[PDB]
Copies of this chain bind each other. A is one copy, B any other.
């Protein structure tokens, strides 16, 4: 329990506290992936083999 990080030490430096249920952080994440996958370029109905 002692070894875990503590959000209350940062919390006394904030104008709006998390003890007041204001989240300490607001983050925007943008992911860009290039995936080379074992799929056809477009998946169009109809089969090559019967």
Contact = CB atoms under 8 A, between A and B. Distances in A.
Nearest to A49: B46
A48 to B, nearest CB: 7
Chain A interface, >50% SS class: loop
Contacts of A50: 46-47, 50
A26 B49 CA distance: 51
B47 A49 contact: yes
A48 B48 CA distance: 7
A21 to B, nearest CB: 58
Contacts of A46: 49-50
7 contacts: A46-B49, A46-B50, A47-B49, A47-B50, A48-B48, A48-B49, A50-B50
